[PDB]
Each structure stands twice: as C-alpha cells, then as structure tokens.
Design a protein around this ligand. Structure first.
Ligand SMILES: Nc1ncnc2c1ncn2[C@@H]1O[C@H](COP(=O)(O)OP(=O)(O)OP(=O)(O)O)[C@@H](O)[C@H]1O
Lengths: 382, 106, 375, 93
C-alpha cells in the first residue's frame, strides 16, 4: 500500500460511544471482546478506503475523521436541515462533497445513478481509490450457505443493513472450480509453450558428451501436458536418446521446457504447501481432466466435503490470501485449534508481505509473537 | 508476446463493428450471420495462439450446449469451436447496444 | 460393377400413353418436345433407383417395368380390388411386396411409419440401394427461392406427391459451402504446420550440397516461421538440409492438395465465364473483374447462376439425372455444357432431357428420341 | 365453376399436370391479355423450337398498339420479325 491508515476517530457512532484507534503501517492486531463494535470499525474502514462512502448514508454518527500516512484527512459529518439528513465528506485537499441520505436510499432502491456518478467523480478527481482494502467477513459460513459470489453482497446487506461493504469472498464450493480451472489453464499454457518452443527451436536449429548426458538427464524430467501428442514427441526424443550447436539448442529448449513446467504449477504448489503446512496425516493435491481433492497415506482419495469447518476456514482464508493494499480480516480464530491459531498469523505473514494487514481477533492465541502490534480497543461511552 | 482471450474478443468486437458499419446490419436477424462473419476471420490459425487464448482467464473450457460441439476426435477443433461459441455468447450480449449505437449513428 | 438402367417400360401412365425407352450405358440424351413425358420418366427412374417406392402410391399407371444392366427386373403394378388400390412391387428374383395405396397416403399425411419401415426392410434385404441417383430438377430457380430440406415438401406441394426427393444447391448455399471449405482447408494447413513442426523436430534430432540449399531457397514462398526461415536462407549438414527441403516440399504439396478441389471447381466455372473471373482472394468468395474490382455472387445473371448450381452439384457427386440443362443459356454454353460436365463427371450414367438439340452436339449417336404412344 | 384440362379422350385433369413450357405459356399469355410498354425478359425459358418460332407472333396478336421490348438468348424468338433485331454489345472501359 501507499496511504496507510494512521489514526481513525469515530465520534458518537450509533449514539453510544466514541472511539479513536491509531494504526501502524504494519500489522494491526486488534484484540477485544464482542460488542466492542470491532465489526463496525472494519466496515467503516472498508467503506472509507475503497471509495464507497455512499454506504455512510445508512450509518448514524456525529463525526468521523480518517487520517492516512501521507497526511490526507477525511472528515465526515451527518447534519440534518429541514428534517433531511446530509452527509458532508470534507477532504483535507480543499474539495468537499455533500449529499442527502434519502437520495442515496432512493438510489439503492433503484438498484433493487446520478449520485453514484457524483461519488465516482469525487473519488476519481481526488484520487481516493489509490489503495483498495479487502474485507474478510466473520460470517463466511453464510457465504458458504449461498454458494466470488455477487448476490452474497445483497444478502448480507439485506440482513446486516446497507452500510455493509461489497462482499468478495470465495466459498469452499467455488474454490474447487477455481482450482480445476487454474490447473487446466496452466496445462494449456504448458502446451502453448511447447508449440512456441517447437517453432522457435525450428528457427534456431535452422540458424560434446556432457550435452548428451544433460539431454539424457533432462529427458526423464502430474505435470504431463494436456496435448499428449507433444508428450509423445518427447517420448520419441527419449527413445532416440536411448538409441554440437544444435545439441546446445536442444539442451536449452529442454531446460526452458522444464523451467516453464515448474513455473506454470509453482503458484498452485505454493498454495498446496501453504495448505499442507497446517494439515497433518492428510494431503490436499491434484492427482489425475484434473481432479482436485484430499489424499491419505493409505492411498485412498476423498472429496472436499469431508473437511471440517476449521479446515474450511483455512481453505477459504489461504486462498483469499494468496489471491491478493490493505487487508482487513474479521475473526480468524473461528473453529480452530489453539496451535493453528498460534501459527496462522505467521503463515499468513509469510504469504502476504508488503501490505497493511489489519486483523481483529477475540482470542489472544492469534496474537502470539506480535504483542507490540496488539492494539486494545476500549469504548469510551458518551 | 502472447495472445489472450481479451485481445481476440476485442478484435472480434472491432470486426463486428466494421461489419455493422459496412454491410448496414439493422436487426438481430442479419447480425446472426454477421457475428459468424466477424468471428471466422478473427479466430487464430497458428496453434500456439489458440492454446494461449484458451489458457487465459475469462473463458471457460466446457460446452453449455453439447450439440454445438462437433463430433470429432480433433481436440484443437473442439477448442476452436469452444472459442467460437464463447465469442458468440459474449457478442450477443453487446449486440443490442451495438445496434443502438448504429441506429444513433445515422 | 454398377447396376445401370438398361430399358424402362411404362404402360398406360396417367391412363394416357405407353412408353418404352432403351438406354445406353452412358450419356442418355433424351430429346423431345414439351408434353412428351420426359420428366414423367425421370421421376419414375428417381423413384425406382433410390428406394422411394412409396411415391408410386401417388401415381396412376398400369404397368411399370424397370430393367437394369445385370438383368434385374422390377415390375410395379397398380391394381384395385373391392374399391381399394394395391401396389404390387414384384422383383425378378422371386420376392415381392404389396401394400395398400390409402395406407401410404395416410402415412404421408402422418409425416405432415410401419409401412415406411417395411419398405426400408424390403429394399435393404434385396440390396436395391447399391447405386443412388442424384436428381437435377428443372425448377432450380424455385430452389433458389427457398441442402435445404423443406424444399422437398414445397416442391411436392406444387408439383404433386409423386415428385422425388429434391437435393439441389442454391447460389447462397454454394457460397456458404465454399466459405466453409476455405476455412476448413486453412485449418487443415495450420494443423499440418504443427504436425510438420513436431515431426521435423524429431527428424532433425534424428539426423545427428549447395544445390539442395538453393532449391530450398527457391521453393520458399508465402506461415510466420516459414517467412523467418526464408529470410535466414536468404542470408555433414547435408541430411538436415534434405529434411528441411522435404518438409518444405511436403508443405507445398499439402497446400496444393488442400486447395485442389476448389481450384478444380474454380477452373470449371471460369472456363465458361469470359469477361469475369470467379476467385477466392482474401474469406470472401465472388467475382473478380479485370479492373481488380470485387462484386458479390448476386451480380450474376440467371445463366451464370445455372452454371454455378450445375457445376457445384456435379463436382459434389452413381447415376445422374439432369432435367433441362438448357435453361437461360446462350447457344455456345449449350454447345459446351455436356463436354465440360462429361469431362468433370466421369464414370456415371448421365441422363439428360433437353428441348433444344444444341445440348446434344458432338453426341448425336446418343440422341434417343422419346415418343408417347397415346392409347 | 371449374377450370382445367380436357384431354381428347374425355378425361378431366387439374392445372397441376402442365409441364414447364405450358406453365410458361399460361403465365405469359395471361398477363399479356390483362394489359403501355411491355418489357419481356427471356421468353424462351423451357420452350422448344416450334413454340419459340410462334410465341412472338401470338403475343403480337394479343398485344397491338403497344411498344414491345423483349430480350432473348435464342434467335428463334426473332424469326418472323427479323428486321427488328438489335444486337447489343457493351462498351467496356
Ligand atoms: N399427374 C400428372 N403428372 C404429370 N403429367 C401428367 C399428369 N396427368 C397428366 N399428365 C400429362 O402427361 C404428360 C407428361 O408431362 P411432363 O411434364 O412429364 O412432360 P414433358 O413435357 O416431357 O416435361 P418437362 O417439361 O418437365 O420436361 C403431359 O402431357 C401432361 O399433361
């Protein structure tokens, strides 16, 4: 990210309490018991950072101040004139926009667009959408229930109010299709690099025993291509090896084929290693059309339906951490054993580097090893 | 470097716009043949490009209509037919607004 | 080898006349004025040879005898007993099928199938569909108005239900067919490119004179890597050069073999046409004026369209029955049509029925004059 | 009322049974009666020589006092009125 959040001041939100939280540029582990408005704070941040300030028309507040790292100040006030409420979003740059709450309510019931275009023009001419924040809700089981889905945003705004931001989160029943599509697409990518290597190596060939030994070693080196005819041309190459400059060209082509073979599947092998780091006595893999699922040391195969809520939380969180700015995670301790809660932040900090990772947990087991980042929330009741 | 599905779809969109501008297609009945006329000259013909387009995101690799898929053992023709079907499906969505833009053009 | 039709005897057809025609083994040029029953003979032959015996329930006749070349005789009689008509299809081998006329009429109005399956079993167990005859109708402009499958029902609606199956291509279908064949040939060339790449890769790996290099440079013509190969050629190792030359020669031979069927059809069309050439430049297929200007296949006159619809339906071809090929043609094309079609359609029985003797020039020994002996 | 064809044997048949030339004569001699300038394009379609040598004379009996412009590929239409032939050759540029 660039404009990291430094300090957010919420005054009289829901007419109950005032809250001012200072954030670092790094990890932000907010620890506090339920009812602290942590979820609200996350929705406020996700409705400020991602340019969706129109959702603030559905929120009851007095004064909301958001300060970034570079020095941009956003002051939001809810003032009503002649029985009609107007939200004033005043930036530190000089410009300020104001709009009626009822106009935004009418626009939302229209979606069931002038103000939407006005908000888009305001955030585009002021460049308020430089950093996009990803929202990980604490109700991802509900996203599994209506199995990224786009109607889930409307369902969650239906039963949690219209202040809720856009919901883009992957279900267990969508990541199976996503993984199958990515594996077949990577196999097709391997086949296209085979055909490009054939045409380029034809042109290059048209223009020692160690090179022959290297070709014999590289002939043996699942990762089989989709176009099996090229696997049969490779079988014929191995059969010919069993039976100068052009040999160097052949060796370079085989080495580039092996390197692209590793590089096409490296992203999914990283995700599989990230999953299998937690899991014990059970491996998630892509044994063979691609089949994706669990494997056991007995050699038995099993569908992804045997997985527990804990393992489902790990799948839905590690896939949505690899496929990534500012990352906001709500309740990562759900249905997890204490050791996985201990190692979850270290695994996600190993896979998500270079971004502002804000997490909100109720269990302190999540915040081991990062106790200096533990910002304790406290509601200052009005 | 490589050719993706979005470049092929933009080329097919440009060819459909050129066909509408030149042949003066006014309704969907003429556009049902104009979409094939634009699609069959924009499909790749170098094998590598085909696989690179099919290996990119945005286009699935399965036939929603099993009867549209030809009954042959040529895999590359199956993938080309999938490209043609997905291009027709995606261009039929934009056909109505392309017709409206052509009507507002004159 | 092939069961060609030798002699057809029609007795009291339409309760009007008797006709007995003897055919040669090839080029039966029937010449006669309008009202002599030529098409009444072509429809009978097309309803006998192609197994369409159900159409004989819609025909009023007394005795129809069909003799093939090998000696197979098929005798069809329409006899009515107790106000119900029965058609008796008696073969010379001993077997014979009979059926009611009203049952076949009810089956035909049902299509608008037990008897159809019985007829199919009868013609399959006797092997009557060894030779299939193609019918070129005299109303192909009506086929231009509407291979199309509804055209059979339309033509039987306005010509009666005795009329055989109509399978004839319109101009806008030979245009679609030519475009599909060009696209398929381009896809075939591209697949032969990738197959050539993989095999030549293997053969060059298997490998380990200047005239061969000069021949390979001369044979290079233009598909993108081959341009780079020609550019590199313009700027011990003999076996790999031989493999390169053989691969280039096989690529050129496959391009010629892919386009030979359409180059033959284009040459056959452009043989007649004089001040306009039909070609497939880049796919759009259409005319090519000597100025270099292009025009659609819609600019063609009725004459040239008859030549397009007859030369495509002769190239995409047994027994061929052509009815009135002299329609809307100038006299020189009438002179040369049989010689061009006999050069392009060899090995089949070509029966033509013409009103103008100009079609039968150079084949006057084949001119069989039909004559209806009115009862 | 019933319009059809009477054979000399006395049988009665509908108008479906006519051949191509008889259909051409029915469509051509009827519109000639219900008639100005008559522009006829290719009257020799599916007609033998004997009818082609007389069709123009019969239609001139049908059409009197009107300008007739016909276009033909066979010169058998042009017989009997051979002094009115206009050979045409386009001037290509
Ligand atoms: N149902 C019928 N179908 C066909 N012809 C019939 C029928 N009933 C009577 N006829 C007569 O039988 C003769 C055969 O007509 P047909 O069309 O076969 O002759 P044609 O002049 O040789 O044909 P064409 O002009 O199609 O080459 C005609 O004299 C016609 O009037």
């Amino acid at each position: 990210a660039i404009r990291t959040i430094s300090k957010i001041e919420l005054s009289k939100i829901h007419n109950r309490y005032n809250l001012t939280v200072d954030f670092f540029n790094d990890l932000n582990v907010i620890h506090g018991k339920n009812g602290a408005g942590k979820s609200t704070l996350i929705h406020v941040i996700a409705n400020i950072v991602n340019g969706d300030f129109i959702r603030f028309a559905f929120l009851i507040f007095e004064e909301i101040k958001a300060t970034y790292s570079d020095g941009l100040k956003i002051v939001i006030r809810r003032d009503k004139i002649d029985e009609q409420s107007f939200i004033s979003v005043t930036l530190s740059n000089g410009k300020y926009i104001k709009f009626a709450v009822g106009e935004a309510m009418a626009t939302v019931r229209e979606i069931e667009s002038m103000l939407a275009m006005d908000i888009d023009k305001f955030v585009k001419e002021n460049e308020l959408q430089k950093v996009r924040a990803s929202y990980f809700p604490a109700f991802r089981t509900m996203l599994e229930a209506w199995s990224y889905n786009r109607k889930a945003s409307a369902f969650a705004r239906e039963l949690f109010g219209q202040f809720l931001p856009s919901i883009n989160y992957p279900s267990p029943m969508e990541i199976e299709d996503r993984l199958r599509e990515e594996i077949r697409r990577a196999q097709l990518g391997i086949a296209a690099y085979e055909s490009r290597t054939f045409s380029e190596s034809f042109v290059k060939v048209f223009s020692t025993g160690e090179l022959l030994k290297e070709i014999e070693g590289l002939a043996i080196a699942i990762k089989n291509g989709y176009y099996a005819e090229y696997s049969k041309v490779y079988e014929e190459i191995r059969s010919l090896i069993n039976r100068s400059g052009a040999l160097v060209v052949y060796r370079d082509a085989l080495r580039d084929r092996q390197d692209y073979q590793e590089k096409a599947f490296s992203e999914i092998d990283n995700y599989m290693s990230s999953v299998n780091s937690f899991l014990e006595d059970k491996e998630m893999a892509y044994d063979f059309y691609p089949k994706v699922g669990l494997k056991f040391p007995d050699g038995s195969w099993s569908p992804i339906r045997v997985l527990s809520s804990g393992e489902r939380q790990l799948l839905t969180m590690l896939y949505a951490a690899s496929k990534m700015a500012i990352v906001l995670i709500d309740e990562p301790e759900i249905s997890l054993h204490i050791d996985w809660q201990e190692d979850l932040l270290k695994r996600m900090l190993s896979q998500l580097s270079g971004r502002q990772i804000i997490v909100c947990t109720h269990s302190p087991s999540i915040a081991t090893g990062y106790e200096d980042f533990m910002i304790n929330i406290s509601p200052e009741f009005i | 470097s490589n050719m993706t599905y979005n470049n092929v779809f933009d080329h097919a969109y440009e060819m459909l716009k050129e066909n509408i501008r030149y042949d003066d297609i006014r309704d969907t009945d003429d556009l049902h043949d104009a979409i094939h006329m634009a699609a069959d000259n924009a499909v790749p013909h170098y094998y590598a490009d085909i696989f690179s387009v099919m290996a990119s995101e945005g286009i699935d690799l399965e036939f929603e209509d099993s009867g549209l898929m030809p009954d042959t053992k040529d895999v590359i023709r199956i993938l080309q037919a999938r490209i043609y079907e997905q291009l027709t499906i995606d261009l039929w969505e934009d056909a109505e607004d392309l017709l409206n833009e052509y009507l507002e053009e004159v």
